[PDB]
Design a protein around this ligand. Sequence first.
Ligand SMILES: [Cl-]
Ligand SMILES: [Cl-]
Ligand SMILES: [Cl-]
Ligand SMILES: [Cl-]
Ligand SMILES: [Cl-]
Ligand SMILES: [Cl-]
Ligand SMILES: [Fe+3]
Ligand SMILES: [Fe+3]
Ligand SMILES: [Fe+3]
Ligand SMILES: [Fe+3]
Ligand SMILES: [Fe+3]
Ligand SMILES: [Fe+3]
Ligand SMILES: [Fe+3]
Ligand SMILES: [Fe+3]
Ligand SMILES: [Fe+3]
Ligand SMILES: [Fe+3]
Ligand SMILES: [Fe+3]
Ligand SMILES: [Fe+3]
Lengths: 244, 244, 244, 247, 244, 247
Amino acid sequence: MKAKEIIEFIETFAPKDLAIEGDNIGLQVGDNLDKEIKKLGIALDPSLSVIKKAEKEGVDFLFTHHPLLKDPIRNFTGVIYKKLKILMENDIILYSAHTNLDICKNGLNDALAELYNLENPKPLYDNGLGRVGIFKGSFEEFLEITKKYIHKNPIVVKSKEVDDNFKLAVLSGYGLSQSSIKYVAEKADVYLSGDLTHHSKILAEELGLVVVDATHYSTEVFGLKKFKEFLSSNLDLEIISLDF
Amino acid sequence: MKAKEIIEFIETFAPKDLAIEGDNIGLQVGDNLDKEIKKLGIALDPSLSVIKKAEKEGVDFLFTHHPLLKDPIRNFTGVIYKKLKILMENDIILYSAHTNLDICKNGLNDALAELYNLENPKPLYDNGLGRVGIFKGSFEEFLEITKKYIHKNPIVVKSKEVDDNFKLAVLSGYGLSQSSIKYVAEKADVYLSGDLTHHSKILAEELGLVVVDATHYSTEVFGLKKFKEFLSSNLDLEIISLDF
Amino acid sequence: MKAKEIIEFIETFAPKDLAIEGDNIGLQVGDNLDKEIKKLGIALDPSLSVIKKAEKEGVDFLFTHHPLLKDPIRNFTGVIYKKLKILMENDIILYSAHTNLDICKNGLNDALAELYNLENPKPLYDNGLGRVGIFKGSFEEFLEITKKYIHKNPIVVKSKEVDDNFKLAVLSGYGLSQSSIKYVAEKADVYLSGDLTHHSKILAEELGLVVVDATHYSTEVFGLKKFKEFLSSNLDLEIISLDF
Amino acid sequence: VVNMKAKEIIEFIETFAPKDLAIEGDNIGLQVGDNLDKEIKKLGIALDPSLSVIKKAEKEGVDFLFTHHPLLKDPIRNFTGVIYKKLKILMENDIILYSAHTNLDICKNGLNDALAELYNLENPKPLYDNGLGRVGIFKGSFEEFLEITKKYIHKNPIVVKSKEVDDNFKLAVLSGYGLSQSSIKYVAEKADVYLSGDLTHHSKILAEELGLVVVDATHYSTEVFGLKKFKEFLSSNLDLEIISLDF
Amino acid sequence: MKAKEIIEFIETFAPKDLAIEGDNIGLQVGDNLDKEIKKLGIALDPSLSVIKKAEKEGVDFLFTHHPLLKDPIRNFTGVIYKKLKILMENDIILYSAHTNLDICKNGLNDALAELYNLENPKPLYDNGLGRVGIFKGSFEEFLEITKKYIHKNPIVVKSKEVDDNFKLAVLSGYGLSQSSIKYVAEKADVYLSGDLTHHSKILAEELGLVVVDATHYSTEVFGLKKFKEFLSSNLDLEIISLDF
Amino acid sequence: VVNMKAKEIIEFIETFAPKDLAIEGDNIGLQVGDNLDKEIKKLGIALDPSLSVIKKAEKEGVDFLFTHHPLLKDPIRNFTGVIYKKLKILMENDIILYSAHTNLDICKNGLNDALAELYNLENPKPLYDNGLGRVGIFKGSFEEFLEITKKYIHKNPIVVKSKEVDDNFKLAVLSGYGLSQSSIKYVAEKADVYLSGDLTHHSKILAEELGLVVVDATHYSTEVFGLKKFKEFLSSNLDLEIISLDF
Ligand SMILES: [Cl-]
Ligand SMILES: [Cl-]
Ligand SMILES: [Cl-]
Ligand SMILES: [Cl-]
Ligand SMILES: [Cl-]
Ligand SMILES: [Cl-]
Ligand SMILES: [Fe+3]
Ligand SMILES: [Fe+3]
Ligand SMILES: [Fe+3]
Ligand SMILES: [Fe+3]
Ligand SMILES: [Fe+3]
Ligand SMILES: [Fe+3]
Ligand SMILES: [Fe+3]
Ligand SMILES: [Fe+3]
Ligand SMILES: [Fe+3]
Ligand SMILES: [Fe+3]
Ligand SMILES: [Fe+3]
Ligand SMILES: [Fe+3]
């Protein structure tokens, strides 16, 4: 398959216009997209060790969820120099689907919603991020699902008692900012996401919002694996994962 | 003692001009500073449950490390309504020493520097946040000191092997931001602070900086306990802690 | 009746979406809106003496035209401390309808337009503020209506002679800014509003726009009284005015 | 009585009120004019560079028009309407328009000092760090202060009597527009009584809450008092015909 | 004819809403638009020498393509004083149609597009600046048309060989900015415009875009002459050009 | 003739043109490179880090590429097209790219000084406060000045002859792009004749209105003149093969 055909396939599943404003999605590093592709590698992060592993495994197309850079640069030294050197010497294409993969149907957030069998799920934010709906069961039933399918030991901020058939909000990745806690506290009883910090925990306790941190890594990798299997079933391509 | 006498004592120990710019230090909520003070309460956070406890324990002067508000507001509803209502009905004075207490001599960062017996301690930043110096011993010894005195199960990002007599940087509270990691990576082998997130962990691994997250809470409470003993020994005032 | 029922009634009459950009309308100070309301107080300003008077008269719901704060704050001392203390210990709800009450049908600007019986009244600004139309009569007749119903001694900047059946623009409150003078000069012969200042007077004279300052207070209180009687006729509630 | 070059008039004015005294962004100095070697037979002084002041300057044969307020505060890139009418008159008649604004407010014996001397303020200090306004003790009763205001500044001042004021009170003066909400909050911590101009509703309410006594003797009159003194200074020192246009 | 009738005629041909954002079009200098106009002067620039010539020729209405000022001023000295003095003393109206004249049908860009007989011309930018389409002929033929009708000695940046029937973009005026070069390189083989500079030339060479600089002046004057002839055929007015 | 480590080359260059001399936001110093202990046998010097310069560097075995202009002024977060092609060549060949931009314009014996010495300006002073360019009196006629320009800089400069120029006039020089509209308004008050590069239409008109004589000897030639002098400076002091790539 040609690189531009892989890119079109991905953009059919997760359209570029779904990405929130300023999100650096699409081609990160690459020249010729008529290049033919024998081995695609998928990763959560375009980290130095992921890129080293890609070179070692003979990956020619590297797909990551997070962009290579959020902040623009005009100098090439240290780590970014090492990364680009490996990608350019091996002519490895680096392509990213970030918030457009979180938001799209059957994307990262939908995967979580599907896992918890959320009743009548709606988007958590107006831009499309996250899902919220009724969880048909008890809080403990919700915890056992999280522990078995997402993360063995989630941090639970038990701000209040939770009744059965509660409102559950999910957001894969970093959803536990202070501003998110205040917003979601008005929309849900329980909030499942990643990257909890001190001030957010205090805030969650004050608002009576139950927060479950199943980590940034695990809440995205769950959906990313399903996406990887989707790629495998539909492309006549060797596909491997590098950091999950 | 009168409230203004307590404040002057605190500002002698931690001068207001030491605070980094835009830090909301000083009087948070207050009326008459000629008021005489029955009970001084010290807390990390001016949280709802802390302020409730202050009211219940008869605290009239509430000292917190974190300010009540970082972002200004023009509406008084929900949680902030509940907090202000308690402080004003009981005429409880709320006063904060934030980064000025982090930076001053024998402050929150110096306490950490003394604990690890840093050789030739220097300020980590030019504004004077954090401390940096040589730890005279092994990484495992460093860990057991951390585990016994700060936090029992710190998260360790072991990006590289660390030699004996390595450079240790310490920062009480939230010091594990992405920009901090890139800055400290140029100055230390090991970085001890709080509030780790995914992107920070990945970045530390790429730069080979060993990060130890002993939590935001514990890295500040350690110095705060020391400050509490300092106040008790010098003032003729009943002094209690509310969230530690 | 409940506070939320009063708020619903007010927002039916003056919907919040009519409010101009950045206008601080709605709930100013308050927590529980299921609270029941025995006595509603209406005022132009949430001033210190108004709030003391509300407390003295046993007002539990205080409605004001101007918001409590335009500039946001993060510290609570002095005058604002006194205001909140009185509202919170007595659990008095403070609620505001500002520009949404100026713009709505039968609102503050419509009340003035109806008084002068403007022929074919149009909004003065595109956002909804002010009214403009033909006054069917002489300038002297317009002055007598002003003197009898709005303000006994208005300041008149007679920049030019005014013919019968002239175009009259009205704007309740502060409409005599320099920018307004230049805008209205293109739309009307006579401009009736409040809060005239030196530079604005000069500008009106240069442009030949006749400006009548019947004061900020009086141009809003006229419509506010009408609103008060509307509330009285429709709610089974004791209603008093506090600064008019 | 003789003629003077425009640049000599400007040098004299800037000696009395140096330009670096002006606060940030204040549009002081030459407003309209090209050649400063121009000879000047008649100097005109005004508070405002208004249309009617400029018409009067043309009618009276003024060659050099001095105003306290600048022609423009906000820059423009189109020349129509009133600004067109003003520039046409200034340019057709080759009239130089020059302004000393906050530098005239702040300088020694300037507009604010004129008020401080009028009320014989004890130990006068600048009200702001930029040097606007004056503050000191008025040695007498509030009633005496009011009669001075009424006799020398304005006959019917607006008084916001927020509290009773004792004899020998602290008085702040600010010529022109000093009654903004932020000024009221600042001066409330420095004085019992605040004398200035351009009172508005929200400011009055704010003064009442803070217990600051505010006296509005108008923007016009509080500057014109000092401007008349400035005109007299010019008349006695320059051998030039000097007239006032809006006072 | 009255000045307002001339203005209406021009705005019918080139509506002001076509002008790009922030473009200072319309009346530059003038008060009364009922003035009678015997002689219209048309110029590219409202320069000092053009304005002197307008006065010398008894021009009553001066139409320029470029505005008098792009950046606003609050002081009137030097050149702008001299320009305004001549315009106001001699009662000359100055009016400009800038980018609305570039963009409109049969405007400056359409004039260039028709000259080179572009097949299926489309606007180059989304705001409607420039034209792009296929030039039916060889590069040498394109070049000889340029030399005969626009400028005898254009600067040619021959970054690549050009095939017959190539894509030609034209932009009258300043179209050779670095940003434009990067944008047009994706849309055309050859770019005709004005005001080439060093960094733009280098960039054109790197991208393989052939750039032809026929100067800012000539690429606009070509269309301006066509517009002048249009005014002559339709208005019963004496019409002269001042800088072409 | 021997090899040098990259850091030794950088140290020599920064002694001649210290980095703190660079104006605000100027992207000077290391552009592309990781290890500065790298050994350098061949130094390449260029005006622009263009694609064709970088291709030529690769072909000539350049290990250290010095350019006057930075690789990027505007930061980027995607690597495609031309920048991809440039970095690929630099990274594959382990070529260090380093730049001295305005710090080379401003330092003593830099690009602007080279021009000032060339025209033998009497009492040369910095043109700007930062301080780009030089200004002083040219001891001679305009025709003599024009012939020096034609001899050393560019045979065919564009001359905007806004006025007649008397002998012993004030000459301003600025290497590179100095003919912006704002520069012209500034220089018009400081000199009779302005020598620089990159003239555009609006700038030409503006110079004609202000009576400032502008001579465009191109952006390229006015910088290459001083760059050649810098290249010879490096040759005499470093035992390295040094070649130029776009001049
Ligand atoms: Cl993220
Ligand atoms: Cl913090
Ligand atoms: Cl208002
Ligand atoms: Cl003023
Ligand atoms: Cl243009
Ligand atoms: Cl440059
Ligand atoms: Fe993520
Ligand atoms: Fe994500
Ligand atoms: Fe903290
Ligand atoms: Fe801290
Ligand atoms: Fe109002
Ligand atoms: Fe209003
Ligand atoms: Fe004034
Ligand atoms: Fe003043
Ligand atoms: Fe143009
Ligand atoms: Fe154009
Ligand atoms: Fe340059
Ligand atoms: Fe340069």
